[PDB]
Swiss-Prot record, chains A, B:
Residues of the full protein shown: 606 to 1109 of 1109
Protein name stated in the entry: Coat protein
Compartments, as annotated in UniProt: Virion
Swiss-Prot record, chain C:
S-S pairs: none
Species, as recorded: Grapevine fanleaf virus (GFLV)
Protein name (record): Coat protein
Residues of the full protein shown: 942 to 1109 of 1109
Location within or outside the cell: Virion
């Protein structure tokens, strides 16, 4: 039944990138209040399967396309409230809402898309939001301001567990080639141009940017798990304009630049696109694959690209002025020719500590995998797919095997002291003593396990306080160490819950 | 599920006749608000079957007995809020709540006990109440004030019809001999008395009183439908005192006074009562029946009575002072020897109009059967079982056949004008014209039908405004009439909904 | 979920005549069910669904049972005359005599049937001239009558043809 509701206000002039508003999923249910809301109070915990319905007058004469973004962990809200760059709005689970199709509906399995059950009385981690943004604007303003209605339908029942089923389990050697929620920002064609080209880079491991801000996301992270890829790009093309706009595209793949000869261009294996539909284009390259990421001073056009050639149009009646937008979605690489995985089932760098200023240094880890900071020494954090995966999910849980390595700053013969690993259950103040471990500094290396988790079952990607095992590294002669390096290797079954993004 | 709740506050000295409070059934559900409340908003109309549960710590050491009174039509509220006489609290559907039995429960089929469906947004007729009063007091005050919790359990579903099934259908020749909700006010025995007698009158058609106030109720009304009754009284006796009080009673029937000879007393066919239980006693009389009502100057003791003789006790430990209360319930007359019905399937008097002061007189009837008032003439209302039945139900509906009769005040030869029966559909202002009827005054009599009802299906026993057929009597030469008598005869199937009472 | 019918299978008010100014009054009905007018007395027409149905169809046809009721304006002992129902076939001028009927005024009530129709089979909701039965009410002492009420009750099968509307 109807569980909650809310209202989005649309401006008569709705342009690309307009922020329309945010609905708070739990507030929608509690303000309504709600046969479902009252069932919720008794259940305590719910792991709903929602049907979201956006009521919306169908219209083929505007060109309007909106994006509903499911931001369960409140990761892009801060960044889109003045204006919403599609890079943010498309970096979390999302849906395209086409004005021509009218009322819109989709399913959200809160178990998958989010991962943790909702507590009736208060937000547990962060408060789940739905963002409404305009992806492609209207061709001309409409007659007046209006509104759309957003509805949540669900049959809430008591949740048996706190945690959902994990969206992703860490494995270096496993990137299938299938994607979800991979939508490219809109490509635009001017109608003052008899022909035109628009390139889309196929270097998919590249991290997207909005100004100086990097927007880490699961898709680019996945691609980065591989050295490169070849095969056929299967996707869908949406033509986001009024019925009285129209265009014909030649869509083809090219390597390092584009040909300038129209006759050569049509000897390539491309496809024609006249209207909304799917497409398959072979990735074209001297090596049959394009690299997953760029080296220094390389450009995305230097490699394999998916090129959109306007060969007839766009056309529109006078006096239209709006550009004709194309939204591309990439669904999978079919018949994939993959490179080696970029990482093996091995250790990788978590953090280097160096340049110690005090002999007594104590690095608290606790039960988290995270970025360190220090006032008394130099922290150098590692960047790798695992760390990105931690950043691109709301919750994670697993066990890390650690290797510690260190080199001396003073003469070996003068050396004394230890790298000590304190292992507790609880906290420094009231904890129980586990497998704490004293490595004489002369060992020059040591190993330990770290539980990344807690009594509840999973960690958010923020600071939190939940009873768990607790770890710390204790240096007593830190100035005698030139570098302390910590490598980790996740034990099989390291789990991630609720795909999301992470702007820095 | 739990639909609503409320709290009754009990004073540490809870004495007989104390008013403990009233809960408003619809407010209990709406303040809770409520999975059931929310289902109700969607249904619009509900005809619930409630389980009422009163949570209440069981205790055998107090002697406390309370009464929950279901007053769906708000008929006794006004008159019990300073002190609740048992005659009021037992005149509507009710339940005895014994402290020794602890938590109490019962079912209310709102379709029967009330008769009309509940509208989510507002009270339709009157607002349904539960009254809580103390029937028998505690033997000594308790340690401190306390509370009991009242709970409503129901699975609300949408009501298909406005009206329930009728509790009663008018029929002169039908009084079975079975009763519901016939509870006699408490009888008390002093412990400073080695033996004692308490009489309960068996002239059940008599209308109960509280001071000068008559309390019309369905049971006495039913009995009045008969001339008299003989047979066996089947009932239950409740001994409402602490476990440390006890008594032995000889219960027997006697005619016109009581014997003064203990040996004669025990040659009668009586029964012994030592404890809570049922009993059967033969109604004893020279005519084998006792009359249903009294004549002038008669007393209920002049006929057949149910006599309670304390033959051992009551006893209690020192120093108790409280009297020992007996509550009697009469369930039926088994093996009944009934008299003729008091009325046949015939007409009976509704109203006489006389002493007209104006020649132009117009008596509005509309669609109601009710008590008339006039500033311009003398109204004399009829008293009979039908009128009582109208008064002792929340709603009624049916058709009345009317006979009008009149005699002249002036000389016949000088007479002119008419008794006119206006029949409309609607009202005087915008109505449609039906079978209106002009009786020349010389006819001296006339007949008509009257619909007692309306588009909704039933009338409350108050003034209301609901589109229906509409009747009026119009006199143009009223001063020429010595008396206008209106008799009525209900057509088969005249229906009553929701038994209740009517204090005047 | 319907309520009771607003009307039963009973009579309803067609017209009340009152406030007579002349002792001789003659109300022509003919073969029509319609709205009366008079210069010599007060006409009060009944409003009910039947009258509306007559108004909301192009043609109708049937038989009406009539009940006439009246009360006296003068003293009963002084009363004289009659309510007479003239029943013809044709018209007042050349008609044949049917079940005409003289109710002495002291009867204070009377009954009759009225054919609403004609040789063609149906009446329009306007004035028309088509050979049929013909009825009239004749008062000879009308000033002695305080009110003459005419009730009707359609016999089963009263028929309406061509649904339409009627602005007033």
């Amino acid at each position: 039944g109807l569980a909650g509701r809310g209202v989005i206000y649309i401006p008569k002039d709705c342009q690309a990138n307009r922020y329309l508003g945010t609905l708070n999923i739990r507030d929608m249910i509690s303000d309504f209040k709600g046969v479902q809301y009252e069932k919720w109070i008794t259940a305590g915990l719910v792991m709903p399967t929602f049907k979201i319905v956006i009521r919306l007058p169908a219209n083929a004469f505007t060109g309007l396309t909106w994006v509903m973004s499911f931001d369960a962990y409140n990761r892009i809200t801060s960044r889109i409230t003045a204006s919403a760059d599609p890079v943010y709005t498309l970096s979390v689970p999302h849906w395209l809402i086409h004005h021509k199709l009218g009322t819109f509906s989709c399913e959200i399995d809160y178990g998958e898309l989010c991962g943790h059950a909702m507590w009736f009385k208060s937000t547990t981690f962060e408060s789940p939001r739905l963002h409404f943004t305009c992806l492609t604007g209207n061709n001309k303003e409409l007659a007046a301001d209006w509104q759309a209605v957003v509805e949540l339908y669900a049959e809430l029942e008591e949740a048996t567990s706190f945690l959902g089923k994990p969206t992703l389990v860490f494995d270096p050697g496993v990137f299938n080639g299938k994607f979800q929620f991979l939508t490219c920002p809109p490509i635009f064609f001017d109608l003052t141009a008899v022909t035109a080209l628009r390139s889309a880079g196929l270097t998919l491991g590249q991290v997207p940017m909005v100004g100086t801000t990097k927007v880490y996301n699961l898709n680019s992270t996945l691609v980065s798990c591989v050295l490169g890829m070849g095969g056929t790009v299967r996707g869908r093309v949406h033509i986001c304009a009024p019925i009285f706009y129209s265009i014909v595209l030649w869509v083809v793949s090219e390597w390092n630049g584009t040909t300038m000869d129209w006759n050569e261009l049509f000897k390539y294996p491309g496809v024609y696109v006249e209207e909304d539909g799917s497409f398959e284009v072979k990735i074209r390259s001297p090596y049959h694959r394009t690299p997953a990421r760029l080296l220094a001073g390389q450009s995305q056009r230097d490699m394999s690209s998916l090129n959109f050639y306007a060969i007839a149009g766009p056309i529109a009646p006078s006096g239209e002025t709006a550009q004709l937008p194309i939204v591309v979605q990439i669904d999978e690489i079919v018949r994939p020719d993959l490179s080696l995985p970029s990482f093996e089932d091995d250790y990788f760098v978590w953090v280097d500590f160096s340049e110690f200023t005090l002999d007594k240094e104590e690095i608290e880890i606790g039960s988290r995998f995270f970025d360190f900071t220090s006032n008394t020494c130099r922290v150098s954090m590692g960047e790798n797919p695992f760390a990105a995966m931690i950043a691109c999910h709301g919750l994670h849980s697993g066990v890390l095997d650690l290797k510690l390595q260190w080199s001396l700053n003073t003469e070996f013969g003068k050396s004394s002291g230890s790298v000590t690993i304190t292992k507790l259950v609880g906290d420094k103040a009231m904890g129980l003593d586990g497998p704490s471990h004293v490595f004489a500094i002369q060992k020059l290396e040591g190993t330990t396990e770290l539980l990344v988790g807690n009594f509840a079952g999973a960690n958010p990607n923020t600071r939190f306080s939940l009873y768990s095992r607790w770890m710390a590294i204790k240096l007593d002669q830190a100035k005698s160490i030139k570098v302390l390096r910590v490598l980790c290797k996740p034990r099989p079954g390291f789990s991630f819950y609720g795909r999301t993004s992470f702007p820095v």
